[PDB]
RNA sequence: UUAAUUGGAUUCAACGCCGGGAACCUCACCGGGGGCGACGGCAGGAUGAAGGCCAGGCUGAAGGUCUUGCCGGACGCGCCGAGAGGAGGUGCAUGGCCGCCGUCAGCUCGUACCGUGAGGCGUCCACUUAAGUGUGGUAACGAGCGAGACCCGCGCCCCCAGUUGCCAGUCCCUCCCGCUCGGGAGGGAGGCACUCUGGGGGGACUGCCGGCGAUAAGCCGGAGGAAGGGGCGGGCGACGGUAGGUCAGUAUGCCCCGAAACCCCCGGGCUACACGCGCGCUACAAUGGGCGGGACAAUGGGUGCCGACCCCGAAAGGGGGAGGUAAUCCCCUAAACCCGCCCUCAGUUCGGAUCGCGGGCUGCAACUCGCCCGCGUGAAGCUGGAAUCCCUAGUACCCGCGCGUCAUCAUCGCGC
């Protein structure tokens, strides 16, 4: 089968189990209260997600 | 709990908006809003060209609904387009207008003065543009144009002014455009008057 | 009787007081007692992050924050009012939940 | 360095030379008289305006005006 | 040093930094194996192309190939151009973002005047301020952005609220002690008194006295006050520069790879060790070590998850399992501190590195290389050369706790 040599594996833990919902990278991903984004994308989309910086 | 509800239904809008930006790149997609009622939702898109967004008599919105319901949430959608609230006081439309004008072939100085004259005509207090790329050379540069009062730091220059950013791909490279417009009702704290007798 | 219990919760503070006073007035106009809006503790979600993409330069951080205001109302059940609080038409950034005891 | 600001003088001098009799020397009297003659919505701004006008009137009435 | 020990950063402003606590993946690195050309044309194709399997060899393992013969029903990398895809090159081709000069006090404009001109004046002088913040004089008179104002917390008072929060004064019942006159503990009925939670107002202005300075800007001292002279702590970083860092977060032009430098899978490495260095943790003991008792917190988190309560085990842990989508149930009776007994200035009852054997948890997999428990063995270390760092008040020092990363593992980061 030529569909058995370009197909991945279903991980369920470890850095390779989750990827950013908008960029697509593994690594530093935010998992607080559910949203799943980079540390880089959350910083330039937050003020539209509702957040604000008070201090 | 309840926070997991609030910040799960705030992300869907982010994704929908960030996709429709690309898709309706032209016709100047202005922004949207979701009204969630029983038995289904209802989407609104303030385009700048109802013709192009609708399609050829309704042969595009079908694809928009199927795509917006199969890849996204929004189990029962109903789209309809509208016309912009104030296209000359919304920075994130002027940014794309100037970016388009640039990548069509105009020189970068005619575009900026056209835009600033139009904006300060339709009744703004102050505007500021800033272009920076590989224009006229092989070492990059940066230029600035402005007209009047415009606050830059503090709290008032975070909620009153309107700012937007865009790109403009070309044959050499990219060019960034960044606008910032002040609505005609500024009312900074310093503007104290005397209600007289 | 059976003392319905309604729980509003929203992120904009102003747009909550107006539905609160709607409920208060509706109750008042008809004949029914009520326990005024009892403020419950705010739940503020906080997210600390770095600031620079690369790793060079000093280390400076951000503090994003999101606050969620809650309330609580106790009221009796009269269909003249139990219905009157159905055409109330909450805004889109508010949550409402009704349940009796 | 409690330097009086720039835009506080430029209005206190305008309403101390417009209603020169509605302003006594009391602090808490002027402090009420200021909120309703203007459209100020702050709270620490009316206090400094009141203080400056009180200084002004007690410095003028007693003679030389600087 | 190695088959590979992948790269970027080198004074401030590189070295617990790339959220970098890497068993597989993450992964870019060494050994091996297999898949991938939308689209236009070429050899060929219903006498049947592309394309798929029970069993057996090769193989680390595999219809991946070959042996074996079954099937499927139209296309065709065996040929040419193109095209996906690229953690491949270039931050000295760019965008966006961020560090530093610097939360420093600067940077300009309109008109007029002075110079043939680059330019100047305003923006200079005198005193004052945290400040190009002010008050006076002046070929200057007015303005814009930065500073201040603005936003969020803390400390004091008042009004409106009373459940899932609190229980003082009344009212019943039960139970204990000097046997009860007195005192104490639980319930349940009722109430928002006090605390608390959080919406709205009040309060401080050099305002009031004395002295400097001109009599102006302003600066010292004293009251009354919960608070005093930006009230205390934070958020917000101007025009520009730094050919500073990032193409290895996303976006992106040019040049190379294009049956490979693209896409998957198994095993290794980033954890190697004569050595120089940065930041930390534990000690060198009495301003202490051990054993038994006694005291008092806050922030935060939980449905792929938090586990009260009961029972097995010496300990790690194991078998059951209420209540919780949250001011309700759970994490959660903190440690330094105090009283009583042993040690008595010793490489020790100080110090616990290094090693042997046995029991467990997470995991698809614990040798390379995870974490936890019990018994045993017991290294350097007796206060530190020239040098150098951080701190002005609920601050420095000393002691513990919670989130993040996370299937397990905190000498770290950010808060209490
Ligand atoms: Mg690996
Ligand atoms: Mg400078
Ligand atoms: Mg550079
Ligand atoms: Mg360089
Ligand atoms: Mg390493
Ligand atoms: Mg010992
Ligand atoms: Mg091991
Ligand atoms: Zn991302």
UniProtKB/Swiss-Prot annotation, chain A:
<protein>
    <recommendedName>
        <fullName>Small ribosomal subunit protein uS14</fullName>
    </recommendedName>
</protein>
<dbReference type="GO" id="GO:0022627">
    <property type="term" value="C:cytosolic small ribosomal subunit"/>
</dbReference>
<comment type="function">
    <text>Binds 16S rRNA, required for the assembly of 30S particles.</text>
</comment>
<keyword id="KW-0687">Ribonucleoprotein</keyword>
<dbReference type="GO" id="GO:0002181">
    <property type="term" value="P:cytoplasmic translation"/>
</dbReference>
<keyword id="KW-0699">rRNA-binding</keyword>
<dbReference type="Pfam" id="PF00253">
    <property type="entry name" value="Ribosomal_S14"/>
</dbReference>
<feature type="binding site">
    <location>
        <position position="23"/>
    </location>
    <ligand>
        <name>Zn(2+)</name>
    </ligand>
</feature>
<dbReference type="InterPro" id="IPR018271">
    <property type="entry name" value="Ribosomal_uS14_CS"/>
</dbReference>
<dbReference type="GO" id="GO:0003735">
    <property type="term" value="F:structural constituent of ribosome"/>
</dbReference>
<feature type="binding site">
    <location>
        <position position="41"/>
    </location>
    <ligand>
        <name>Zn(2+)</name>
    </ligand>
</feature>
<keyword id="KW-0862">Zinc</keyword>
UniProtKB/Swiss-Prot annotation, chain B:
<dbReference type="InterPro" id="IPR004087">
    <property type="entry name" value="KH_dom"/>
</dbReference>
<dbReference type="GO" id="GO:0022627">
    <property type="term" value="C:cytosolic small ribosomal subunit"/>
</dbReference>
<dbReference type="InterPro" id="IPR001351">
    <property type="entry name" value="Ribosomal_uS3_C"/>
</dbReference>
<dbReference type="Pfam" id="PF07650">
    <property type="entry name" value="KH_2"/>
</dbReference>
<keyword id="KW-0687">Ribonucleoprotein</keyword>
<feature type="domain" description="KH type-2">
    <location>
        <begin position="16"/>
        <end position="85"/>
    </location>
</feature>
<dbReference type="InterPro" id="IPR015946">
    <property type="entry name" value="KH_dom-like_a/b"/>
</dbReference>
<dbReference type="InterPro" id="IPR027488">
    <property type="entry name" value="Ribosomal_uS3_arc"/>
</dbReference>
<comment type="function">
    <text>Binds the lower part of the 30S subunit head.</text>
</comment>
<dbReference type="GO" id="GO:0019843">
    <property type="term" value="F:rRNA binding"/>
</dbReference>
<comment type="similarity">
    <text>Belongs to the universal ribosomal protein uS3 family.</text>
</comment>
<dbReference type="InterPro" id="IPR005703">
    <property type="entry name" value="Ribosomal_uS3_euk/arc"/>
</dbReference>
Swiss-Prot record, chain C:
<comment type="similarity">
    <text>Belongs to the universal ribosomal protein uS10 family.</text>
</comment>
<dbReference type="InterPro" id="IPR001848">
    <property type="entry name" value="Ribosomal_uS10"/>
</dbReference>
<comment type="subunit">
    <text>Part of the 30S ribosomal subunit.</text>
</comment>
<dbReference type="InterPro" id="IPR036838">
    <property type="entry name" value="Ribosomal_uS10_dom_sf"/>
</dbReference>
<dbReference type="GO" id="GO:0015935">
    <property type="term" value="C:small ribosomal subunit"/>
</dbReference>
<keyword id="KW-0687">Ribonucleoprotein</keyword>
<dbReference type="GO" id="GO:0006412">
    <property type="term" value="P:translation"/>
</dbReference>
<protein>
    <recommendedName>
        <fullName>Small ribosomal subunit protein uS10</fullName>
    </recommendedName>
</protein>
<dbReference type="Pfam" id="PF00338">
    <property type="entry name" value="Ribosomal_S10"/>
</dbReference>
<keyword id="KW-0689">Ribosomal protein</keyword>
<dbReference type="InterPro" id="IPR018268">
    <property type="entry name" value="Ribosomal_uS10_CS"/>
</dbReference>
<dbReference type="InterPro" id="IPR005729">
    <property type="entry name" value="Ribosomal_uS10_euk/arc"/>
</dbReference>
UniProtKB/Swiss-Prot annotation, chain D:
<dbReference type="GO" id="GO:0003735">
    <property type="term" value="F:structural constituent of ribosome"/>
</dbReference>
<keyword id="KW-0689">Ribosomal protein</keyword>
<protein>
    <recommendedName>
        <fullName>Small ribosomal subunit protein eS17</fullName>
    </recommendedName>
</protein>
<dbReference type="Pfam" id="PF00833">
    <property type="entry name" value="Ribosomal_S17e"/>
</dbReference>
<dbReference type="GO" id="GO:0006412">
    <property type="term" value="P:translation"/>
</dbReference>
<comment type="similarity">
    <text>Belongs to the eukaryotic ribosomal protein eS17 family.</text>
</comment>
<keyword id="KW-0687">Ribonucleoprotein</keyword>
<dbReference type="GO" id="GO:0005829">
    <property type="term" value="C:cytosol"/>
</dbReference>
<dbReference type="GO" id="GO:0005840">
    <property type="term" value="C:ribosome"/>
</dbReference>
<dbReference type="GO" id="GO:1990904">
    <property type="term" value="C:ribonucleoprotein complex"/>
</dbReference>
<dbReference type="InterPro" id="IPR036401">
    <property type="entry name" value="Ribosomal_eS17_sf"/>
</dbReference>
<dbReference type="InterPro" id="IPR001210">
    <property type="entry name" value="Ribosomal_eS17"/>
</dbReference>
């Amino acid at each position: 089968a030529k569909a058995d040599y370009n197909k991945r594996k279903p991980r369920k833990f470890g850095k390779g189990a989750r990827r950013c919902i908008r960029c697509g990278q593994y690594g530093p991903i935010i998992r607080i209260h559910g949203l799943m984004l980079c540390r880089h994308c959350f910083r330039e989309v937050a003020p539209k997600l509702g957040f604000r910086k008070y201090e | 709990a309840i926070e997991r509800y609030f910040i799960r239904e705030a992300v869907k809008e982010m994704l929908i908006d960030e996709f429709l930006e690309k898709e309706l790149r032209r016709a100047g997609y202005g922004g949207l809003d979701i009204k969630k009622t029983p038995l289904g939702t209802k989407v609104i898109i303030f385009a700048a060209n109802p013709g192009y967004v609708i399609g050829r008599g309704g042969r595009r919105i079908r694809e928009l609904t199927r795509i917006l319901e199969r890849q996204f949430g929004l189990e029962n959608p109903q789209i309809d387009v509208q016309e912009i609230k104030n296209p000359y006081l919304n920075a994130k439309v002027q940014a794309v207008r100037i970016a388009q004008a640039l990548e069509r072939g105009i020189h970068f100085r005619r575009a900026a003065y056209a835009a600033m004259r139009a904006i300060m005509s339709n009744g703004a207090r102050g505007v500021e543009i800033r272009i920076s790329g590989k224009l006229t050379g092989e070492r990059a540069k940066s230029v600035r144009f402005y007209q009047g009062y415009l606050a830059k730091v503090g709290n008032p220059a975070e909620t009153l002014v309107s700012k937007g950013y865009a790109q403009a791909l070309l044959k050499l490279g990219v060019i960034g455009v960044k606008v910032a417009i002040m609505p005609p009702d500024a009312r900074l704290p310093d503007e104290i008057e005397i209600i007289e007798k | 009787m059976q003392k319905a219990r309604i729980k509003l919760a929203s992120t904009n503070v102003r747009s909550l007081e107006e539905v609160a006073n709607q409920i208060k007035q509706i109750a008042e106009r008809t004949g029914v007692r009520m326990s005024g809006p009892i403020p419950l503790p705010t739940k503020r979600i906080r997210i600390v992050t770095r600031k620079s993409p690369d790793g060079e330069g000093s280390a400076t951080f951000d503090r994003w924050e999101l606050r969620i205001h809650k309330r609580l109302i106790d009221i009796e059940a009269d269909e003249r009012a139990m219905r009157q609080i159905m055409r109330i038409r909450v805004p889109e950034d508010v949550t409402i939940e009704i349940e009796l005891i | 360095g409690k330097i009086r600001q720039g835009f506080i003088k430029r209005v206190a001098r305008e309403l101390f030379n417009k209603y020169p009799n509605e302003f006594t020397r009391d602090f808490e009297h002027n402090k009420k008289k200021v909120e309703e003659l203007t459209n100020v919505t702050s709270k620490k701004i009316r206090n400094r305006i009141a203080g400056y006008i009180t200084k002004l009137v007690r410095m003028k009435e007693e003679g030389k005006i600087l």
